[PDB]
Amino acid sequence: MEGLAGYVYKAASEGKVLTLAALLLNRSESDIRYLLGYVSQQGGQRSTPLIIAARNGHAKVVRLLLEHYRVQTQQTGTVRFDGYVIDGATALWCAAGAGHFEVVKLLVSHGANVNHTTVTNSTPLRAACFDGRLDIVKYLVENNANISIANKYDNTCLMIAAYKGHTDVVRYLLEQRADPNAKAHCGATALHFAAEAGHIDIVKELIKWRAAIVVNGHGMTPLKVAAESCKADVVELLLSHADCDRRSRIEALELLGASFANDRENYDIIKTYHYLYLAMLERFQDGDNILEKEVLPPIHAYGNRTECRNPQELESIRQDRDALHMEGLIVRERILGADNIDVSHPIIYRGAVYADNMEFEQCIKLWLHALHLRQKGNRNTHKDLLRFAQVFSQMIHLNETVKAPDIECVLRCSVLEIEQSMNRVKNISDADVHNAMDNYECNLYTFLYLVCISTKTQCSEEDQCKINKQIYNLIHLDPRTREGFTLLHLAVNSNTPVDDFHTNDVCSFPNALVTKLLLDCGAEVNAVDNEGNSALHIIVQYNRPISDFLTLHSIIISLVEAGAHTDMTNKQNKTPLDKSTTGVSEILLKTQ
Amino acid sequence: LMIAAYKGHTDVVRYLLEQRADPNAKAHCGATALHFAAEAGHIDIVKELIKWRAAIVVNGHGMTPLKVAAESCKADVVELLLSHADCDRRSRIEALELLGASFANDRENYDIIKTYHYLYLAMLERFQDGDNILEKEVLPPIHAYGNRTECRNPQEL
Amino acid sequence: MEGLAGYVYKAASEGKVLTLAALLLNRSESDIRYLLGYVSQQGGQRSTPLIIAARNGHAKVVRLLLEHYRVQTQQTGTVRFDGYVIDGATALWCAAGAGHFEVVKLLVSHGANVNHTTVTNSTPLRAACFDGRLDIVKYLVENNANISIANKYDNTC
Amino acid sequence: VQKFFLEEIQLGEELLAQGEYEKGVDHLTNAIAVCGQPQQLLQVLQQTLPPPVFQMLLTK
Amino acid sequence: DAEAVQKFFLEEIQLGEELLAQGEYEKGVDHLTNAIAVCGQPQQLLQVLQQTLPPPVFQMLLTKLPT
Amino acid sequence: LPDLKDAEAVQKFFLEEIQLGEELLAQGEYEKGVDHLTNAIAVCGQPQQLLQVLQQTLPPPVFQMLLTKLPT
């Protein structure tokens, strides 16, 4: 029964209570039992029609369904909503997961699982805490739900409530005998999450409970995780608790100001200079047994000057925001290390401003440190490498030449990132294997974008020899796509997507220049795809022989010189001339 | 119809062909609703009328839309006209001749290497068949253009 | 300096953009912010170029003031000119009381203060209720400012 | 028709569920008996409305 | 003065609309409060005032109309 | 054009040239508004920074119409 199940679902999804009465009654009980039990394709999920009605809070509709035939309240089904796609829990959890108190107060008296788990062991208390709906949160603890339901990431519902600015939901769990000391899988507490967004009122409740205050699993004290944020009220609040030692309380304001100008959503140098100067005034306030910054030389990538020392020294560099942004970023470079993600974030923002301010020379130099920092952190740079080639394409339009050592350093680290990205597919098995399949593949595209713009731009001979090494590195890696393509086949195919930025103007796939650079380093010209077509077969399948024949004429002679088999066949036994569909390429194939 | 085809308003062009308006309403100047589309490389506009049976016909001067598309150095819609209706191999070879002619002799498009490769494609296809061979008509050398006698062989080109 | 502050305040009050754009042209951020920090009393009421731009209704002026210029929502201005003229006004509060939904949603997307309390601790939510503009209240509720912020007389929105 | 009666027992009181109970309860009065289970549909329709409106639907 | 008001009424008719167009809704009505109720046809002005002004602006001028 | 004065018409006569265009922006004769605008940009002291400013002060038909007449 397909349509009848959907009509039963339609009776509860749209809230038409008369259809629900006419469906459960006026017919048999066994057939409707299968209909109201679950849905198959309705909503892209497999939940009971009462459950999807609880998602919309149809409290009156779900009340009538229980009167005729009591559906099992503990029955579960998929609910794809906020918090990623979820094989959702019971309807009481789903009503709590929908933030609808009208359905929660009915199932509890009717009989429901108070502490029912989800795929990520989510209790209905956490589901209400995820929505931050206080009256539902007040009700589950009145139903005596467990206050210590920690996630698979060791995130208790109180810590889940601490993600947002729920100053009332967080304080209510504190009233319900729950101290905020349940650390996450990364050791994160409710203190750190409230300090991420500067929730001074939430921390004050946790201050009021007087339970404990400690660092997370990253070794970051709650003032430090607020220091990398842009809200000094938390560090000010912890100053009342006297947990701010004078070394940490000064570098906090040093970090607090810098993030308040080194953010896309937070860019104000006036408080940034004020916080840095007041901290350095406090840094110089110690007088005897003075404490100072661990001095860091300027990065070959980021900037050309080291950090300031005198409190008034940073006042003179306030006029040029480039100097003070760097000065505020060195002090968080030394205290957070090269592996911190939150100190790598200002690196991308700075060059993006220079991209907006046409300082493409400073944009490329400084952005190399973000790739340098993320190499230390051993994380993906697929957004970083794409942003390099986008800005590389932008300055070609402005005709600002790149630095050949700069374009080599990004290329040298990209293949190391791709080697990590290829190993990332090896490192993961079932968590995000399709994401990892799409992770290394898009990284190869960025390298293809980076190499293509490198060929277009001027490059020194000593760097160009090292530039071809990364291409020589990847052609030895031989990355095989989902369809069996390789790096050579990626440039050969004209169906290769190009980034929406000016990289369309610098990538001309099928790109002869990239392919010519690919052929000298050992391209697999006779390699076959999933359909068995060689590099000669893919290039002849192009349907535009007139638009870019210069790319075609270069690749007809040269790829044949690499060893392309004119008599090669596909998995469907297709020859290059047989699968041509282009007279110009086939005649070129006949000549070659 | 041709006014939107004169511009890049491809949404108006693809809509108006469905409004029971023929693509063959030809102006006396010679525009067959694709001649006015053959100036800015309107690959999206021409694809609509090629689908809509554009009915290729020469202008008032006698130049084909394939030639007029080659007049604006727009190789994108040249292939559309070549792939539409009759192949007409005699014009197919000269389409490469005409398009390559301007790439070394146009201010907006000064590409010397593209002139050879288009002519080489013309020279390849002119003698590709072997028998029933066609050759360029031997116009007399013109003193303005030196004393050259065209390219009847791929070796001299 | 003060005369230039009056000039930029009148330009923001009127609604022209290039006038104060040229008035701030070739200037550092110090005097630019000072001109934008003209919180001086006009008509007996404290007002600011950002505030009077939000009070105006021109979403373009405030979209330039938040993006290309450095001004902050923490500001002092009128909240109700007829009989109240109470200070401590957020630009979002001024826009909500005036009723310009485009300026309200633009300031919300910018990140303006949604839970501000004046000396009479009045929220922009109750100003939107006072104006009766449904979409402003809907946007504010979707952005989850509050619902139970009352006046000093415990006067709910 | 019995199928139309089922449609009447399913869409006759569409205004009643939408708020306009004047034209819905009156229309569902005949539609409750027109269904194959008149007593069951009338009790369910009374249960579909409030207990204060259960008597109004039943006496309609 | 009242004959000069017949031209002075046209001044707020000219000048006062920019004050509403700029965004001074209250001040524009306040500037137009001095204007209205001196012309020979207030009703003929009223039937277009229902739609010349924005719907919130006109009803606020209705409050200022007898003032 | 005011002969590209060093410091007199860079800010004084410059303001009215947009103001003539800004009125003609409010009038609706944008082609006349562009004319008064495009003389101001030519006589502006630092007009390259105003490319981002002037690309959104306009109705969308004038976004490219002023840009085409910007070198003029």
Side-chain angles (χ1 to χ4, degrees), chain A residues 1-558 562-564 576 583, chain B, chain C, chain D residues 12 17 19 24 31 33 36 38 50-52, chain E, chain F:
Chain A
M1 287 178 277
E2 307 303 284
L4 299 165
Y7 186 39
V8 163
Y9 155 83
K10 279 191 291 298
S13 63
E14 85 191 4
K16 188 47 181 146
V17 70
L18 191 77
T19 45
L20 187 134
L23 275 165
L24 275 74
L25 287 180
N26 210 19
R27 271 186 72 186
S28 162
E29 55 96 22
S30 69
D31 50 350
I32 301 299
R33 173 76 262 177
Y34 155 73
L35 304 188
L36 62 90
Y38 78 114
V39 308
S40 180
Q41 289 288 329
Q42 286 82 10
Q45 44 83 26
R46 296 268 319 274
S47 70
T48 287
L50 180 136
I51 295 179
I52 195 62
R55 181 59 194 79
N56 315 132
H58 287 110
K60 189 52 185 175
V61 174
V62 302
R63 170 155 152 165
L64 275 296
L65 194 149
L66 305 158
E67 293 170 4
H68 317 125
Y69 309 116
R70 260 147 184 82
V71 72
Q72 293 316 302
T73 68
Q74 289 74 241
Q75 204 268 320
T76 181
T78 310
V79 170
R80 64 179 177 87
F81 265 102
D82 56 337
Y84 211 61
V85 56
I86 295 289
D87 308 333
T90 182
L92 174 68
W93 179 93
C94 285
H100 281 80
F101 188 73
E102 58 255 62
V103 186
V104 167
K105 59 187 172 67
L106 267 295
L107 271 70
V108 168
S109 69
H110 197 95
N113 200 356
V114 180
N115 293 265
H116 189 72
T117 52
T118 305
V119 181
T120 81
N121 57 66
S122 190
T123 189
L125 183 54
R126 181 195 303 170
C129 278
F130 195 79
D131 301 330
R133 198 65 261 169
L134 187 51
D135 50 0
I136 317 185
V137 168
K138 289 191 302 272
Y139 194 34
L140 277 296
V141 294
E142 280 303 317
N143 311 321
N144 265 1
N146 177 225
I147 49 177
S148 280
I149 303 279
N151 208 341
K152 47 190 279 184
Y153 295 152
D154 209 1
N155 277 111
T156 310
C157 60
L158 172 60
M159 318 291 122
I160 300 297
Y163 265 90
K164 277 82 65 180
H166 304 315
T167 183
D168 51 341
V169 188
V170 161
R171 75 187 294 173
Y172 197 80
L173 271 300
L174 261 59
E175 296 145 35
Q176 300 294 295
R177 280 80 54 201
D179 71 314
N181 299 311
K183 282 86 189 166
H185 74 307
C186 56
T189 68
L191 294 174
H192 301 98
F193 282 128
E196 274 277 329
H199 297 322
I200 176 176
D201 283 314
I202 299 190
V203 176
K204 190 67 177 68
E205 300 300 312
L206 314 186
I207 285 307
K208 178 250 291 177
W209 196 248
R210 299 276 82 193
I213 174 166
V214 77
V215 298
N216 45 41
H218 289 237
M220 308 322 181
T221 186
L223 60 88
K224 187 161 173 68
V225 73
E228 53 189 3
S229 189
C230 316
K231 296 97 180 172
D233 47 353
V234 172
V235 172
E236 185 49 65
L237 192 60
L238 275 69
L239 272 160
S240 314
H241 199 198
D243 314 332
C244 299
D245 59 89
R246 78 154 307 136
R247 167 62 86 186
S248 73
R249 90 174 66 182
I250 287 164
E251 63 91 20
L253 291 158
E254 268 171 347
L255 265 58
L256 278 156
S259 46
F260 193 68
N262 270 311
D263 206 33
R264 191 59 184 263
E265 294 88 3
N266 304 120
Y267 171 53
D268 307 285
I269 212 69
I270 54 170
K271 215 62 175 174
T272 287
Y273 156 74
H274 278 122
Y275 283 160
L276 277 160
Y277 180 52
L278 177 60
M280 205 157 292
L281 272 188
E282 197 74 27
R283 186 139 276 175
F284 270 60
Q285 198 263 330
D286 213 358
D288 296 332
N289 49 79
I290 201 81
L291 56 90
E292 272 282 86
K293 285 84 59 183
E294 53 181 1
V295 64
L296 175 72
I299 308 107
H300 67 283
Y302 200 108
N304 211 9
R305 189 190 174 276
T306 188
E307 52 186 356
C308 285
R309 172 168 289 104
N310 270 318
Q312 91 289 337
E313 192 186 355
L314 56 88
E315 188 172 84
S316 66
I317 72 171
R318 191 258 172 201
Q319 199 83 2
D320 46 350
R321 266 79 171 271
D322 195 8
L324 196 147
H325 280 95
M326 169 263 298
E327 200 265 332
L329 189 151
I330 298 298
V331 310
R332 40 194 295 130
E333 193 68 41
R334 47 99 179 172
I335 195 66
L336 296 154
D339 66 325
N340 177 233
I341 302 172
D342 214 1
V343 75
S344 71
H345 162 62
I347 319 289
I348 295 90
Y349 163 76
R350 273 287 99 199
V353 171
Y354 306 147
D356 305 327
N357 280 317
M358 304 307 127
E359 293 186 356
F360 284 135
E361 176 64 42
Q362 310 311 104
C363 167
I364 292 314
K365 280 185 65 178
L366 267 70
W367 270 9
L368 275 171
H369 202 42
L371 180 51
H372 288 342
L373 287 201
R374 283 189 173 179
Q375 282 319 121
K376 314 289 175 61
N378 192 359
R379 61 187 68 90
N380 189 18
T381 73
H382 85 299
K383 40 185 76 172
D384 181 68
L385 294 172
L386 184 57
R387 270 186 270 97
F388 268 108
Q390 282 199 39
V391 173
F392 278 157
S393 60
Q394 208 183 327
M395 65 184 73
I396 292 299
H397 275 252
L398 193 142
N399 302 118
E400 212 276 328
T401 187
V402 300
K403 299 286 102 176
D406 282 349
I407 208 166
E408 153 68 32
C409 284
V410 63
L411 272 175
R412 162 143 31 87
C413 294
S414 61
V415 71
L416 169 60
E417 186 52 52
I418 286 184
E419 276 155 350
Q420 193 261 8
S421 88
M422 182 54 85
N423 288 332
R424 167 162 41 230
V425 193
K426 273 80 175 175
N427 285 331
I428 206 68
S429 180
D430 302 311
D432 50 345
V433 65
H434 189 205
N435 195 5
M437 185 68 74
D438 301 319
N439 211 319
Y440 85 101
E441 273 293 300
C442 75
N443 274 119
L444 303 158
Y445 272 61
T446 56
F447 182 85
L448 187 65
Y449 301 150
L450 283 173
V451 164
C452 196
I453 192 49
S454 82
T455 53
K456 285 322 192 88
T457 199
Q458 195 270 331
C459 289
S460 71
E461 178 62 37
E462 52 92 15
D463 271 303
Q464 191 59 56
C465 289
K466 303 175 304 193
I467 276 162
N468 213 4
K469 180 71 185 68
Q470 293 97 26
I471 306 147
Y472 173 81
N473 192 295
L474 268 193
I475 202 61
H476 266 286
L477 189 145
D478 189 52
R480 309 294 293 169
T481 72
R482 275 158 314 280
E483 55 267 13
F485 286 164
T486 183
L487 189 57
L488 170 76
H489 290 187
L490 190 52
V492 161
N493 190 17
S494 79
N495 312 135
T496 294
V498 177
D499 187 80
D500 56 340
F501 203 72
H502 291 271
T503 65
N504 303 116
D505 297 328
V506 311
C507 298
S508 80
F509 304 146
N511 193 290
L513 299 166
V514 181
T515 318
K516 184 68 68 69
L517 212 47
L518 267 164
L519 286 174
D520 50 64
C521 70
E524 302 181 356
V525 71
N526 280 318
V528 297
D529 64 331
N530 201 4
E531 184 178 1
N533 284 267
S534 53
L536 203 71
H537 287 99
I538 305 159
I539 192 54
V540 70
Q541 278 166 90
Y542 191 28
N543 58 344
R544 301 164 74 235
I546 305 171
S547 177
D548 60 357
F549 179 64
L550 282 170
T551 67
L552 182 61
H553 179 273
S554 309
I555 203 180
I556 283 298
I557 304 305
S558 178
Chain B
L1 167 66
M2 303 195 280
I3 312 296
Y6 184 56
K7 298 288 95 176
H9 297 286
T10 178
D11 276 340
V12 190
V13 161
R14 73 191 52 218
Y15 173 75
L16 196 148
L17 56 84
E18 296 156 358
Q19 303 323 290
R20 285 199 90 167
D22 58 283
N24 303 350
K26 180 177 173 290
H28 73 86
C29 308
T32 179
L34 196 146
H35 285 139
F36 282 167
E39 270 86 9
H42 299 306
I43 190 65
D44 46 359
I45 282 178
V46 174
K47 180 64 67 68
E48 295 292 325
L49 280 74
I50 286 308
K51 178 258 295 178
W52 214 242
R53 200 52 71 89
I56 177 168
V57 60
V58 310
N59 55 1
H61 292 286
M63 292 176 289
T64 79
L66 169 62
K67 285 175 187 178
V68 164
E71 196 266 338
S72 175
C73 275
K74 302 308 182 287
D76 44 350
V77 300
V78 160
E79 186 260 330
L80 300 201
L81 287 147
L82 188 48
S83 62
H84 171 76
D86 46 349
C87 182
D88 189 75
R89 184 179 178 271
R90 183 179 63 83
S91 73
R92 169 184 189 95
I93 304 153
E94 79 191 358
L96 272 299
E97 296 169 355
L98 186 58
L99 192 54
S102 46
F103 269 108
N105 303 277
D106 181 43
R107 194 252 167 273
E108 281 92 358
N109 313 104
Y110 190 41
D111 294 323
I112 180 72
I113 49 171
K114 210 179 303 195
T115 290
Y116 174 75
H117 296 75
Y118 285 171
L119 278 160
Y120 193 66
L121 272 184
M123 274 319 112
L124 274 184
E125 263 188 345
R126 184 68 65 86
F127 323 120
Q128 182 255 314
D129 197 75
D131 290 333
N132 58 91
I133 189 168
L134 300 191
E135 289 273 9
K136 275 158 138 188
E137 56 269 17
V138 189
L139 280 194
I142 313 177
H143 183 79
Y145 315 124
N147 279 310
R148 302 288 309 278
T149 177
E150 308 172 30
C151 276
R152 306 182 305 159
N153 272 325
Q155 189 268 331
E156 50 190 359
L157 175 73
Chain C
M1 274 291 112
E2 197 268 322
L4 298 172
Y7 287 154
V8 302
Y9 170 80
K10 288 177 291 186
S13 80
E14 206 276 343
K16 293 292 116 177
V17 288
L18 275 298
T19 44
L20 74 164
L23 281 158
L24 302 178
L25 191 78
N26 321 317
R27 307 283 166 93
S28 171
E29 205 54 42
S30 75
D31 57 356
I32 276 177
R33 282 170 315 113
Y34 158 68
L35 297 176
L36 262 59
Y38 190 62
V39 76
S40 167
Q41 295 85 240
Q42 276 81 242
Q45 160 62 50
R46 275 101 156 172
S47 187
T48 305
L50 172 73
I51 280 287
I52 203 62
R55 192 46 69 98
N56 220 13
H58 281 124
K60 201 263 180 200
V61 180
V62 290
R63 98 182 288 157
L64 274 295
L65 284 179
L66 67 94
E67 183 87 38
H68 283 111
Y69 300 128
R70 314 274 77 77
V71 74
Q72 288 313 107
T73 78
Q74 289 80 240
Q75 201 63 256
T76 286
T78 175
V79 303
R80 186 66 264 164
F81 191 75
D82 46 352
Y84 290 77
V85 286
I86 319 170
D87 274 321
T90 304
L92 175 59
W93 190 5
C94 287
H100 320 292
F101 172 62
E102 47 270 27
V103 186
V104 159
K105 67 201 298 189
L106 168 66
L107 279 152
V108 161
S109 58
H110 160 74
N113 197 357
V114 307
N115 291 356
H116 151 76
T117 42
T118 185
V119 289
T120 79
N121 51 57
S122 162
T123 175
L125 162 65
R126 81 174 273 276
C129 296
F130 196 90
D131 215 345
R133 200 64 61 84
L134 188 151
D135 51 359
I136 297 189
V137 186
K138 201 160 206 164
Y139 209 85
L140 190 141
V141 164
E142 276 178 36
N143 284 102
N144 322 289
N146 208 311
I147 45 164
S148 68
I149 296 187
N151 295 104
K152 59 182 180 294
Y153 311 101
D154 298 336
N155 205 334
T156 315
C157 57
Chain E
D1 189 16
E3 179 46 53
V5 163
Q6 293 293 110
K7 328 178 209 164
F8 178 70
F9 161 67
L10 264 64
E11 297 175 32
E12 295 98 7
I13 288 299
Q14 265 83 66
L15 182 56
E17 190 171 3
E18 293 89 5
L19 208 54
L20 303 152
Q22 285 153 2
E24 297 94 353
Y25 287 158
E26 174 195 20
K27 286 306 292 167
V29 166
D30 279 337
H31 198 83
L32 275 180
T33 312
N34 188 231
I36 199 166
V38 305
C39 65
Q41 291 163 350
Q43 304 293 318
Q44 187 169 130
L45 189 67
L46 265 174
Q47 43 88 17
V48 287
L49 269 170
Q50 159 198 38
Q51 55 262 11
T52 52
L53 295 185
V57 179
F58 165 62
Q59 51 92 22
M60 197 255 287
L61 179 62
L62 288 186
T63 66
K64 270 86 173 176
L65 184 137
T67 71
Chain F
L1 57 90
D3 72 89
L4 277 78
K5 195 62 68 68
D6 175 68
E8 197 44 68
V10 192
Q11 48 98 29
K12 188 173 295 299
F13 187 66
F14 170 75
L15 268 175
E16 283 102 12
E17 273 296 306
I18 296 96
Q19 195 148 5
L20 265 295
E22 266 167 339
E23 290 293 327
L24 286 152
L25 276 157
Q27 296 296 328
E29 279 94 352
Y30 302 108
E31 50 272 357
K32 210 163 153 192
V34 162
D35 290 329
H36 291 99
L37 273 166
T38 199
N39 294 115
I41 304 184
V43 308
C44 174
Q46 291 85 1
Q48 207 49 55
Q49 200 260 317
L50 304 177
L51 172 60
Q52 188 49 246
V53 182
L54 270 297
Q55 69 97 24
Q56 45 92 33
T57 51
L58 295 174
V62 194
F63 280 166
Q64 42 86 35
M65 179 180 96
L66 189 145
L67 188 58
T68 46
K69 305 210 260 159
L70 179 56
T72 72

